[PDB]
């Protein structure tokens, strides 16, 4: 009913975290981030994840994903996930460890495998993205055929991601 | 000069409604919604409409649409219209009854016929969308030829919409 905020998390005073949200050690949450597990709950934000300004995490009343701990979440964000400016993560949603979600991108009703890089102005909806795939800027990914076809993440993509965080 | 808020509306304490805005019975307005009829005015939000977080309703100083009541509005939102996360409705704008505007979608200088479903990450600008049309995710609808060509809404589309509200 109230958020669990790890004493080692750095949550900006002006961030809004509401409801059954677990924020792990080393998570950074910028000003003007909204995390509301007031409809869909619970949410998990894994260790050393980063949420930038304008990021929203919300969830549908119904529909869940299976967490790494074998519990059900509206939203599971793994470790060292980067949710950048103006990204929307809408449950049901799974982001595996080391994922990057670029500016103004959306993940809704989707599972994104670890080590995937979603670029800027993209939509990921209704799909499982396999681990380690790249979603180009402006992509609209709404079918499993499209998600199974995505190219692999290259080292240049992760270096790009590390620069932006 | 000040908003008329129906006693049966549910407006979040942190929503910002400014200027000549009429909010009808049963309208729900989330936290972090901005409705400013401070340039373009007036705005009408019809019965049992829903505005989700990040939604903005603004309007140009000049340019109007004809309301169902035969009065001129910067923004006319009909009954049971769903304006979802991060949608922008910019006057001049008409949304007919039972319309759905998906995540991060924009309606600007446009008339959207009743019972239309606008999906996620779409733009609707400078057009009349006939009643009961579907605008796919990622569509950029900026010409009347494009708007006259849109496919019809199917029952699966409205069921999708009801799930998201």
């Amino acid at each position: 009913a109230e958020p669990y905020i790890d004493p080692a998390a750095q949550v900006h005073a002006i961030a809004s975290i509401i409801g059954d949200v677990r924020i792990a050690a080393g998570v950074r949450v910028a000003a003007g981030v909204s995390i509301r597990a007031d409809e869909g709950a619970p949410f998990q934000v894994g260790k050393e994840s980063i949420l930038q300004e304008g990021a929203v995490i919300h969830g549908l009343e119904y529909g869940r994903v299976l967490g790494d701990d074998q519990a059900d979440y509206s939203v599971w964000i793994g470790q060292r996930v980067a949710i950048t400016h103006k990204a929307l993560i809408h449950g049901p949603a799974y982001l595996g460890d080391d994922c990057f979600v670029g500016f103004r991108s959306t993940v809704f009703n989707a599972r994104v495998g670890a080590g995937s890089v979603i670029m800027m102005h993209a939509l990921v909806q209704d799909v499982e993205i396999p681990p380690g795939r790249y979603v180009p800027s402006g992509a609209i990914i709404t079918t499993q055929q499209q998600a199974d076809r995505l190219p692999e993440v290259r080292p240049e993509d992760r270096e790009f991601a590390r620069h932006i965080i | 000069a000040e908003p008329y808020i129906d006693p049966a509306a549910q407006v979040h304490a942190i929503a910002s409604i400014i200027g000549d805005v009429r909010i009808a019975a049963g309208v729900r307005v989330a936290a972090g919604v901005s409705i400013r009829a401070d340039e373009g005015a007036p705005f009408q939000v019809g019965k049992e409409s829903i505005l989700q977080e990040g939604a903005v309703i603004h309007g140009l100083e000049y340019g109007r649409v004809l309301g169902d009541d035969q009065a001129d509005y910067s923004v006319w939102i009909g009954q049971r219209v769903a304006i979802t996360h991060k949608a922008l409705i910019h006057g001049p704008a008409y949304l007919g009854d039972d319309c759905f505007v998906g995540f991060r979608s924009t309606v600007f200088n446009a008339r959207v016929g009743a019972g239309s479903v606008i999906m996620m990450h779409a733009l609707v600008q400078d057009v009349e969308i006939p009643p009961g049309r579907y605008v796919p995710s990622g569509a950029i609808i900026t010409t009347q030829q494009q708007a006259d060509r849109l496919p019809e809404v199917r029952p699966e589309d409205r069921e999708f919409a009801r799930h998201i509200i």
């Binding site: 799974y94 495998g113 499982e128 499993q144 | -």
Partner: peptide
Amino acid sequence: GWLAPEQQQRIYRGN
């Protein structure tokens, strides 16, 4: 939901 059950299962759990 709105998807085929086997597709919602890829999102719930993954292959």
